[PDB]
């Protein structure tokens, strides 16, 4: 059998049924909504997952602590289906691509109910992070519900890049500014949660939330399926936002190590990952899979952004552990 720990809403429904059905290997699917939740289980140590999926910065600190056995790439033949230029971008956390295979990647930004926003904000354009980070905008959007992510790794590097500071700064003076920005709009945040906005956007409970690329595209497509006239949209603000990459990695204390390789060779297939991305709303690392994908996903500039959009997006860096504590303190101070 095989045990997996992946994000919420991050796989097509029949991907597993197809896998077991082809290979015979029965799967157990466990889920988490933040990077910290996963990272916490990893130092617990005895978390018995054969396949876990961190983000690009989190992966690098967990390598430097020896959590994931090396990749026996002899058992990953479809490894060459991977974008060569994607891999090299992620040597900054995994040198020489030794431990982690890419899965899905995307951005993060604003997801909003167009009707309920313009109702409370008029024709003001939703294009600046100042929608969420300015009290004069938030004080009114607060009747309609705003949702931040419960993670200092998302909320704080976003507030930094909003003011124009370095989102990967090590400076306590900077986090000071970002802190007292967030703590001036906190009275209007209806909750901090990295996942329960997807459903909460489609059902009209909130009208704006800090969200991920596909999370919102999911939330939108969920909304119209319900067929009640909820227009959910996703807009990467003008100040840019966080670009990231999630990668699958086999822990050291894992035991279905072979089964884990087979499941990862079946997701390097340009056919399957298409079905995954087509459903979840995130771009994958298999270039051969785009010609096979639903166009509205494989053609979207917010799913697959162009360079001009990229050339102003920050990639979270492997921060010194001194600084991570400044994050966690500052973010818990906002609580």
């Amino acid at each position: 059998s095989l045990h997996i720990y992946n994000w919420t809403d991050y796989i097509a429904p029949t991907t597993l049924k197809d896998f077991t059905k082809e290979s015979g290997i029965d799967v157990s699917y466990d889920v988490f909504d933040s990077n910290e939740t996963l990272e916490g289980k990893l130092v617990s140590g005895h978390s018995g997952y054969d396949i876990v999926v961190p983000s690009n910065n989190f992966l690098g600190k967990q390598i430097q602590a020896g959590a994931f056995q090396k990749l026996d790439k002899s058992k990953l033949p479809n490894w060459k289906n991977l974008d060569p230029a994607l891999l090299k971008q992620l040597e900054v956390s995994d040198p020489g691509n030794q431990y982690a295979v890419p899965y899905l990647w995307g951005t993060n930004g604003i997801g909003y109910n167009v009707a309920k926003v313009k109702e409370v904000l008029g024709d003001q354009p939703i294009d600046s992070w100042a929608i969420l980070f300015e009290p004069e905008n938030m004080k009114k959007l607060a009747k309609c519900g705003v949702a931040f992510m419960d993670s200092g790794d998302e909320m704080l590097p976003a507030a930094l890049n909003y003011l124009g500071l370095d989102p990967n700064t090590h400076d306590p003076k900077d986090y000071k500014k970002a802190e007292e920005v967030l703590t001036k709009v906190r009275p209007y945040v209806s909750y901090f949660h990295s996942s329960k906005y997807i459903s909460d956007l489609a059902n009209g409970n909130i009208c704006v939330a800090f969200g991920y690329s596909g999370d919102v595209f999911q939330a939108a497509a969920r909304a119209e399926e319900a067929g009640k006239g909820i227009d959910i949209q996703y807009v990467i603000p003008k100040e840019g936002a966080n670009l990231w990459f999630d990668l699958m990695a086999i822990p050291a204390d894992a035991k279905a190590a072979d089964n884990a390789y087979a499941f990862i060779d079946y997701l390097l297939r340009p056919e399957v990952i298409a079905k995954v991305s087509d459903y979840v709303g995130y771009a994958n690392a298999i270039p051969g899979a785009r010609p096979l994908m639903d166009k509205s996903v494989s053609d979207s500039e917010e799913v697959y952004p162009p360079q001009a959009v990229l050339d102003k997006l920050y990639v979270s860096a492997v921060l010194p552990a001194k600084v991570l504590r400044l994050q966690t303190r500052t973010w818990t101070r906002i609580k």
Epitope: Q233, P291, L292, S298, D299, S300, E301, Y304, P306
Partner: single-chain antibody, 225 residues
Framework: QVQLVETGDEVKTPGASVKVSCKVS????????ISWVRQAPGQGLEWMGW????????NYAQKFQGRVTMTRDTSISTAYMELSRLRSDDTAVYYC?????????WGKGTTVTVSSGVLTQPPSVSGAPGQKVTISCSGS????????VSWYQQLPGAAPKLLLY???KRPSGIPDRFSASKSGPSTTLAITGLQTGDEADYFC???????????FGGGTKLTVL
């Protein structure tokens, strides 16, 4: 080399039914999609449907679902489109294009003649040799606004060619003069050292994420003096 070869050519009665085969050569057939672009005489390109040759997926333009059917013998690397209430209208050349989001290699087109009984784009521009000229194409948040765009150049009597992809990328061969720009819901092609050989119809093509079709521009005819 990479080519699609299309069917024989076919005269058909107003109640009928036509099948157009399309055989691909010299590329992993199951790797790229396939697209059907119809063109009535004297008018523009029209999206019909897209078939995923790997999984049999069928995206029919809403105008044709209920009358079109798209299939594929993977064994013999071909695709099939069947219209099924041939009308005084459908008289057209039926082109067949390898779809990699855009359509880089086009077939040569099959003609159906049935006899018995969108995107605001300007209709034509006229320019002098040497000068620069522009062609716009205005969509919406559903289309030019959200998704990547493709520009196609149809020289006289020829099947459409790929001029630009990925909002503004040039295929090997398309020279420097041809480049596109993009703001909000508009993409504006602009040819610079306007030669004589550039006399043609130019079409923008995007995917409208709400209608679920590859919306073409009405087309502009370019006459160079």
């Amino acid at each position: 080399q990479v080519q699609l070869v299309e069917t024989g050519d076919e005269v058909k009665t107003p109640g009928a039914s036509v099948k157009v085969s399309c055989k691909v050569s010299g590329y992993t057939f199951t790797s790229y999609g396939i697209s059907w672009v119809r063109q009535a005489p004297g008018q523009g390109l029209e999206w019909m449907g897209w078939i995923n040759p790997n999984s049999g997926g069928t995206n029919y333009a809403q105008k044709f679902q209920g009358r079109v059917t798209m299939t594929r013998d993977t064994s013999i690397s071909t695709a099939y489109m069947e219209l099924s209430r041939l009308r005084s209208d459908d008289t057209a050349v039926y082109y067949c294009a390898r779809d990699k989001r855009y359509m880089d290699v086009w077939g040569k087109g099959t003609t159906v003649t049935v006899s018995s009984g969108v995107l605001t784009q300007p209709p034509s521009v006229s320019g002098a040799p040497g000068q620069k000229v522009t062609i716009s194409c205005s969509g919406s948040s559903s289309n030019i606004g959200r998704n990547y765009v493709s520009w196609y150049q149809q020289l006289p009597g020829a099947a459409p060619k790929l001029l630009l992809y990925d909002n503004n990328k040039r295929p090997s061969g398309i020279p420097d003069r041809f480049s596109a720009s993009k703001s909000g819901p508009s993409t504006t092609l602009a040819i610079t050292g306007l030669q004589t050989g550039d006399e043609a119809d130019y079409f923008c093509g995007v995917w409208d994420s709400s209608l679920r079709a590859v919306l073409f521009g009405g087309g502009t005819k370019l006459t160079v003096l």
